[PDB]
Amino acid sequence: LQLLNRQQELNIAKSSAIGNVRIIDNAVTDPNPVRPKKTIIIVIGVVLG
């Protein structure tokens, strides 16, 4: 009976198994592109010219 209780506890622990890792924010895409950066490109062009 002690081994049965231990096996049940191990079943609970195996099934729950919440690890030390958690997903707080799932991925979403920023609708504004990060490249090309138009303003810095045009400023670089003007200054280079």
Binding site: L4, N5, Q8, N11, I12, S15, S16, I18
Partner: protein, 41 residues
């Protein structure tokens, strides 16, 4: 802005207290799903 900040603070408080029992809550959920010698029961 004060209403929004009150809502943010209360949401954070509720989320924290909810997470501080997540492992036990999942264990209880699986125990409920696992409920069917009678000493084990």
């Amino acid at each position: 802005i004060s209403h929004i900040l009150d809502s943010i603070s209360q949401n954070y408080l509720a989320q924290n207290i909810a997470r501080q029992a997540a492992q036990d809550a999942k264990s209880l959920e699986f125990l409920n799903q696992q409920l069917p010698g009678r000493a084990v029961y």
